[PDB]
């Protein structure tokens, strides 16, 4: 396996399938400036004035700001699952797995990948929304009522720390691939094949980081630990979502996410 060619293929698949990259996000977040959403009035103005991928008339009828924000979060989550599915399938070895193992890997991997990619659009003060045309403040998200504020803040804590590693998109492409191709997922049929693919991706990641981050201390083992950390982040996330299902019975949960969280514990 030619690791340079492998890494380049997975980088190109990443650029092909994720419109918002860390490079683009950073060029916005550091200077057409985003519209800042920090309260009800600015959220309303942003719904009227910004271009959103999911049109608002498709979301459930507005009841309160915290639930509307949750629905916008769900929208973006589902859209990123679509992109991650196409990204994964752009990897030949992955598409060679039977479709049931592909689904198992995505089921248990997409939220780990999502929360790693989130750092790309985050800084300590907020995150980009609406394809970079809006910026929602972290203090506004903290202001939402429980339990919605509580499901947001841990992701910021993880993301700010993750951004201290200063990965670029070419690194992230391999890191995300390694998260999806994980031999540890429950119910996987061809564990040895998945473990073998994962191992090739990890070898490509170390090779790539050597070339791309020649001065970095311990970056490869630091990223292996981040993979473990993301497992814990998603465990806690799923536990919170299952609680929302029990205590917020009026709040809609997208059926795809329902399927994803079925049988998690
Ligand atoms: C996909 C990433 C992760 N998110 C969501 C997100 C970011 C950080 C922390 C938590 C988040 O979502 C937690 C709940 C997810 C439930 C879906 C589920 O997993 O079941 C986003 O990119 C995002 C999208 C839209 C907004 C938004 C907020 C106010 C007004 C307009 C838009 C904010 C964020
Ligand atoms: C779009 C990629 C992400 C797919 C995530 C959803 C996977 O859900 C699972 O789908 C299977 C049917 O395939 C069922 O057998 C399982 O009960 C269910 O848990
Ligand atoms: K940051």
Swiss-Prot record:
Disulfide bonds: none annotated. Belongs to the nuclear hormone receptor family. NR1 subfamily. It comes from Homo sapiens. Heterodimer with the retinoid X receptor. Interacts (via domain NR LBD) with CRY1 and CRY2 in a ligand-dependent manner. It comes from the Eukaryota. This is Peroxisome proliferator-activated receptor delta. The chain holds residues 173 to 441 of 441 of the full protein. Ubiquitous with maximal levels in placenta and skeletal muscle. Ligand-activated transcription factor key mediator of energy metabolism in adipose tissues. Receptor that binds peroxisome proliferators such as hypolipidemic drugs and fatty acids. Has a preference for poly-unsaturated fatty acids, such as gamma-linoleic acid and eicosapentanoic acid. Once activated by a ligand, the receptor binds to promoter elements of target genes. Regulates the peroxisomal beta-oxidation pathway of fatty acids. Functions as transcription activator for the acyl-CoA oxidase gene. Decreases expression of NPC1L1 once activated by a ligand. GO terms for cellular component: chromatin; nucleoplasm; nucleus. It is found in: Nucleus. The gene is PPARD. 'Lys-48'-linked polyubiquitinated; leading to proteasomal degradation. Deubiquitinated and stabilized by OTUD3. One of its GO terms (molecular function) is nuclear steroid receptor activity. Keywords: Activator, DNA-binding, Metal-binding, Nucleus, Receptor, Transcription, Transcription regulation, Ubl conjugation, Zinc, Zinc-finger. One of its GO terms (biological process) is positive regulation of skeletal muscle tissue regeneration. Residues 35-263 form the NR LBD domain.
């Amino acid at each position: 396996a030619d690791l340079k060619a492998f890494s380049k293929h997975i980088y190109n698949a990443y650029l092909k399938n994720f419109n918002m990259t860390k490079k683009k996000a950073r060029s916005i977040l550091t200077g057409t400036a985003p519209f800042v959403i920090h309260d009800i009035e600015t959220l309303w103005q942003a719904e009227k004035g910004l271009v959103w991928k999911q049109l608002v008339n498709g979301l459930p009828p507005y009841k309160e700001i915290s639930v509307h924000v949750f629905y916008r979060c769900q929208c973006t989550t589902v859209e990123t699952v679509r992109e991650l599915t196409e990204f994964a399938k752009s990897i030949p070895s992955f598409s060679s797995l039977f479709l049931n193992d592909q689904v198992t890997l995505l089921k248990y991997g997409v939220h780990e990948a999502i929360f790693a990619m989130l750092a790309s659009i985050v800084n300590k003060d907020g995150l980009l929304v609406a394809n970079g045309s809006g910026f929602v403040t972290r203090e506004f998200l903290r202001s939402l009522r429980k339990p919605f504020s509580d499901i947001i803040e841990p992701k910021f804590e993880f993301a700010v720390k993750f951004n201290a590693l200063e990965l670029d998109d070419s690194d992230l492409a391999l890191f995300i691939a390694a998260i999806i191709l994980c031999g540890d997922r429950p119910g996987l049929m061809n564990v040895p094949r998945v473990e073998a693919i994962q191992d090739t991706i990890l070898r490509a990641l170390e090779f790539h980081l050597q070339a791309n981050h020649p001065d970095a201390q311990y970056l490869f083992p630091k990223l292996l630990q981040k993979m473990a950390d993301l497992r814990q982040l998603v465990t806690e996330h799923a536990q919170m979502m299952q609680r929302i299902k029990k205590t917020e019975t009026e709040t809609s949960l997208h059926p795809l996410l329902q399927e994803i969280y079925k049988d998690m514990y």
